[PDB]
Design a protein around this ligand. Structure first.
Ligand SMILES: *CCC(=O)NC[C@H]1CC[C@H]2C=C[C@@H](C(=O)NCc3ccccc3)N2C(=O)[C@H]1NC(=O)[C@H](C)NC
Ligand SMILES: [Zn+2]
Length: 98
């Protein structure tokens, strides 16, 4: 089941980015679409579904890819991007989370 149901909508996730830092190259839209909302602290975001947090976003970061890198069994991730996408990311980073 879903970890944070108040953040299940894209619109709700999007509202959380009001004070999103300008230093941070990734945009709210790409993050919100990947299931992530802002927790109000530095560049910390959390997935509404798996409750996995990411931070320290770098230029060129793709939120979906970072999602599959660290929380590959998130169901929202798998439903939206599919098990192939996730397997590919994991096969390319086989020794993260080992
Ligand atoms: C994105 C810029 C930045 O903050 N970089 C690194 C730091 C991330 C955030 C702090 C907050 C706690 C700790 C952390 O991430 N803990 C999770 C964890 C780590 C290891 C095992 C279990 C849980 N943070 C950092 O590690 C922190 N790192 C540093 O400041 C490093 C030591 N120096 C650049
Ligand atoms: Zn997730």
């Amino acid at each position: 089941s879903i970890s944070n149901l108040s953040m299940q909508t894209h619109a709700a996730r999007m509202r959380t980015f009001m004070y999103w830092p300008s230093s941070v190259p990734v945009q709210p839209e790409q993050l919100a679409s990947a299931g992530f909302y802002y927790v109000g602290r530095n560049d910390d975001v959390k997935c509404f579904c798996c409750d996995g947090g990411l931070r320290c976003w770098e230029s060129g970061d793709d939120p979906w890819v970072e999602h599959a890198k660290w929380f590959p069994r998130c169901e929202f991730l798998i439903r939206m991007k599919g098990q192939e996408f996730v397997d590919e990311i994991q096969g390319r980073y086989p020794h993260l989370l080992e």
